[PDB]
RNA sequence: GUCCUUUUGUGCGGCCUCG
């Protein structure tokens, strides 16, 4: 889900447009790209986005 | 150990131009400077230094029918859309049309699938997003006359109320800018609204 | 160098008698030598000397 | 002097030079005099007599120099000029497929805003290369097919619709330079198709 | 520590602005100038009392420039640390340099030479804290430490504390 | 560190290793270090030198 | 390398029960990051038994080398790569080798073998207190999710039951 | 950017041990000192302010401009997202987030009763606001806690502490 | 959340480990009719940036890693001079190169290699061991430790009268001879690459 | 493929010009 700042901040040009409204991902295939799960994460710290 | 890597082509242009072949390839929009205008070719450079072409049914829109040569410059920088890349030669083929440059946008294969994408939220959200493009600027209008009054049309009736039959004030329209409402008593307590749309305006505020 | 032409000297630095001269035009051509640089680094016919 | 005694305190006494030593407090702003680490300014920690030890300012880090070498300045007002590679708001090629601009410098090192966002701290010999861009390739296009040169002020419409003057420009990127983003300096980059020209 | 202050600020006006809303537009430029804004003499200003009715006087139209220029006299409520002073704090995140916590927008450095060395950093631990027998500090849990050093910049301020004295550490 | 003290032994008896065995003999390393060591160093061997 | 990697450990000299519980622990992990390895080693190669129980007995034999014996990865690989695969003759006579580990999988065994001492040290305190406790008979949960315990989150959630329940005697010893 | 109401201070060449900030020996320089002057030029004493008092402050300002400026028509996220500037609006929700998280009284009446004893008590009339400040906002329980925690208040030992700290401990809402 | 993360981050260090091993696991290059690692001959060329001023550079390693013979040519490359001139160095009695390399700034370069293989093609030069004779060799050289190397104050030490082009050169050359060891003199910078 | 450009002395002395 996606804070203000992240409502905002988002763009196409960013990186973490990838997941910006991602759902139903399981947690058994995120091993298989660790990028995407790391990117989340740091978008989770700079306050954009967070993960449930 | 392995044997000396030797470069490819992919490999070659990565090297001499750092554009991958994923940042730079079919379909993908640049802005490049024009060197050459001809009746049939046009010659760009990029910002990397690949020397882009542009043939004349990819300059002109189908409807146009004026030279080439009236319609750009040399030295002016305008979009273009990627047709065909030559990852050897370092040559590259470019369209100006509407068509390529402006309607490819989603660049990027993002799994838009409704199981896996959020795809109601999305829309409202651009929905939004352009709810709050729509957002102008607005303010009021000065006008100087004598019998100009900046009042609602309940005001200018209450204030032609003290006044007798006859006598005229001015307020400014609901319609625009553009419009002048002027309000004179026809009776006590019976007042008529005019519009009277002004044309050749030198200003907003002008008359 | 200057802002003005140097088109009208001739190749022993000299201006010839005849020619039409304005304001700033040059009409002698003198250089003094100065020690060249780092553009030793590889200039093979522009390096100021 | 400073004594218990307050007569004492009132008296002025000339001292050689030979026989003093710098009184060096816990929580004070110091800057370095000589050595490896001079011109380094930070907070006193640590204070093991001769040897004292201080929580750096520009390296942000723990630094111990011997007492001898050590200033009381409250401010650090360090110059960087004559130094490095690479001026301020310099666009430095960071590796391959790497580019940013320099934020803030340093003695040793380089603060560099990458075009994504992130930032990064490099020393000097790290960074591959200083992209000199000619001034035709140094050009770009609003959103609306209007010019846009260095120096043009444009504001965005997108996003959080800042305005900002245009300080480098890279690819589709424009770095801008923006009075009211005190966060880095001004600097915050944004995609040329994300901005108008006024 | 929250204080209140009589504060003073400068600003000019453009003349494209002359116009019957000119004292709340002063107004609202007065308050996005000023809330929020961090100044090392002063601290961290947060909130303007009666920020709609402040008296903005009469502005000086600056000769050869035609802007006018206002004087705009408010109180305002400022926060502002002090060396050798005990406040409480948030961790906000876990290094092996040590601990950085948040009080209100000041973010507060804490190394590990000024750390008990009976709080040793634990990075296998979910999530990273400073661990002892009797006590474990980590992300959020509240700490109590006393400001050693302030560090002024440009238009941010960097406080030192400490928990090395008694009645500090984990609360 | 060891890399350091290794070339500063060597550099004493002579910057020259005739043997491999040289390593523990000399007292230049320790037991598990020339251990591991012994078959990841060598010394160029030339018939000519040495026809013994 | 092995002494900056072990830097950090307080103590690491593990006692010979102890010792095995790291090897099992290991051998479990392994398990668990290789199971698509394990899946294609068990389909592949189904005419022959147990590949598992030689892979548990290289994985361990791993672990003695880099605990006891100090063997670096290159050494090992180099120098010891019959512990590290497994050969047999089929059915035509056909020699077959089978690659049971590589050298990723001896780092991942040395990462391993570094984790667990946190988790070791954790199991220590936690058993330390409970003897503090002195419970007059031995609590049923406290050893069933104590004996099956293998990551220290679950090492967490014990000592909250514990600080819980037995706040009274926590209180007594020193909220 | 913002200047103070005092100015002057003008260059001199005696040099003064009280110019350095320090919360233990009471010295909060020029511009934080004890007397302060108004607008008017009159004289004026030192605010000091606890989180409770500056939390109701704040609270009430902060809703009284959202009162305004809507027309006049308790989030505190809506509440902070009435103020203008991004950076402006980070601050104001550290700031909210902080004080909610260390709120000894979130009510008008207690905070009033805490300021009164804390103002009319008659061993309080000597005590410095910063000292009131700190006492009514780090909420301390014990007098050795209290003066190892603020070092100020050893010298005033004819201040019934035990007491008044009984009383905040027992205004504040377990 | 803890948990992905910690596997999450394993995963990406392994891959981040293989990608460096498919990095730095080079040979150096193999003369054609000599046995594998046998360290070649290395003749560089570069201008720079490929503008109007700017001259070509010369640097010749042998096999034993020693520096001869670095050379400034004095004319524009796309003429017949640059061409009888670097025919004249190839074929040079003291220089005998078993590999060319060429790299540079931007696009230019590929001028540069086209000239060098044609002149290479046309004029036969072959590789002079002082029977089967073979052309010698023109390829781009990845020059991601070469532009490290010529900032690096121990290059700059080491060849204290040579230009920042010299020292692109001799870091091109080392690369061709050894890649490991090139790698391995980045020290801390190594980590900034593009792994 | 080629096109591409930037700035000025000082200190005295003398002779003049308009009041």
Redesign the interface.
Known sequence: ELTERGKLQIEPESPYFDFKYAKNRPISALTATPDLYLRMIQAENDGLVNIK | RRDFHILNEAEIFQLLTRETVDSFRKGMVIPVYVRKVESSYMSVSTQSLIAGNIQRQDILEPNDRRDPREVYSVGQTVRACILDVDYYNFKCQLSLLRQFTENQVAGLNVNRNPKFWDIESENRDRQEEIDKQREESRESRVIKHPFFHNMKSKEAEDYLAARPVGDVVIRPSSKGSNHITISWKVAPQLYQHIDVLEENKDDANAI | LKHGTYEKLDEDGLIAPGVRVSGDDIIIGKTTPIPPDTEELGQRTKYHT | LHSDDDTINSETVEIPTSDLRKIFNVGDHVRVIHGKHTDDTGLIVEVNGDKVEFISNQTKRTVIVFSNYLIKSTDSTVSINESGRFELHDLVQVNSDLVGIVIRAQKDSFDVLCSDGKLLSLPPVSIYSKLNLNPNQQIAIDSNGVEVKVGDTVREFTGERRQGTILHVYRNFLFLRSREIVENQGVFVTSSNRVKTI | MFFLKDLSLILTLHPSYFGPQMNQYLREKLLTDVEGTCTGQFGYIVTVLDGMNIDVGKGRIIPGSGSAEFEVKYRAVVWKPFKGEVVDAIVSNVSPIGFFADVGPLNVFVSTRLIPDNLVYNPSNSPPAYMSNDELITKGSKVRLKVVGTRTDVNEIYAIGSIKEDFLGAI | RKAAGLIQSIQRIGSNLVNRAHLITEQLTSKTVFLNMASFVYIVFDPDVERN | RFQAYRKSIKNYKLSDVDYSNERDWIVEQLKLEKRDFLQHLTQAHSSVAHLEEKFEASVKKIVDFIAIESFEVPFIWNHRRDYALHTYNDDSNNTIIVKLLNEDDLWRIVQLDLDYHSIHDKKAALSSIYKQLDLDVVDPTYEEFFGSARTLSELQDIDDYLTFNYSSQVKNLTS | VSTSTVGARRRRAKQQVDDEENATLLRLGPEFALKQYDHDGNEHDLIALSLSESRLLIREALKARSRARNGGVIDDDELAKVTSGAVANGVVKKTLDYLNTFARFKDEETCTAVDQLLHNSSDCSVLHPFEIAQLSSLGCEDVDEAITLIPSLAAKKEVNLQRILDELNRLEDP | ?????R???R??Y??V??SFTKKI??????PPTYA?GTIPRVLTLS??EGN??????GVFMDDSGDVKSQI?????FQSRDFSDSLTRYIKSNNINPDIIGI?????H??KLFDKVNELVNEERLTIEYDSDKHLIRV??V???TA??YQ??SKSSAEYPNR???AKYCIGLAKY?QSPLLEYLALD??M????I
Not at chain 9, 25 to 30: F, G, L, R
Not at chain 9, 52 to 57: E, K, N, Q, S, Y
């Open positions: 959340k803890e948990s992905i993360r596997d999450c981050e995963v990406l392994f891959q480990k293989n696991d080079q040979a150096p290059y193999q594998k201008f720079g109007r001023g700017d001259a070509v550079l400034k040519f004095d004319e524009d790299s540079g700034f931007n696009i370069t590929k390829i781009y990845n020059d991601e532009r490290l900032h690096s230009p920042q082009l061709i801390e910078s980590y900034s690459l593009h």
